[PDB]
Amino acid sequence: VQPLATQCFQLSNMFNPQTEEEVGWDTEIKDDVIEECNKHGGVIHIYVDKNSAQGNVYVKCPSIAAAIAAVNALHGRWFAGKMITAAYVPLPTYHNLFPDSMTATQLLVPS
Amino acid sequence: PLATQCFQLSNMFNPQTEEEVGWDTEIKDDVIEECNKHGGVIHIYVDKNSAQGNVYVKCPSIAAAIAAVNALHGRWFAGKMITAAYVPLPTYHNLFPDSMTATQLLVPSR
């Protein structure tokens, strides 16, 4: 029984720190995910965990509908033979990991 | 953020998990098994008195701890997302003085 959608999710397999070779790769991912979210329901917080062996990117969207749209756009792509996968994170768990994300309510839309 | 030999896992269990016999041995063995796919583990303390599900770990080098932390942080365990935070070496040695002289790599219970 799959977990219900929340405003918050974790993408996996977005990179592999052992093999990433391009300078600035993790910021490129952050900006590219923001850009993709902005073709859907936007995004209010994002963190690329550059040390994560499983390639985790954390995202908070302004509504559950927005998160579903972002998750459905990003998951299902293939990187180095692995599928980008998304898992919803309960709000209290996400806020504990990222305390600044709790009071963020304005969309990251580059000027 | 300061990498060390020591870390704290959180959200690994809750008080209801404690209602089954041997629950903490299952958790210790699962942590050991994962550490032994990386750099091993020489001390582990499952904090039965934490509502937050805390497990304390010391590895034989900073490299071993980093390999474990980067594999475990953000991982799902028993239906919950786990977080890992480094513990300064003197902090861990003050909290768990018996970990100072532990040097044998741990293996899962029989």
């Binding site: 799959q2 977990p3 898992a87 | 699962d30 994962e34 991982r75 799902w76 365990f77 239906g79």
Partner: peptide, 8 residues
């Protein structure tokens, strides 16, 4: 059979 990667 560990509980790592066990989804809720």
């Amino acid at each position: 059979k560990s509980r790592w990667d066990e989804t809720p």
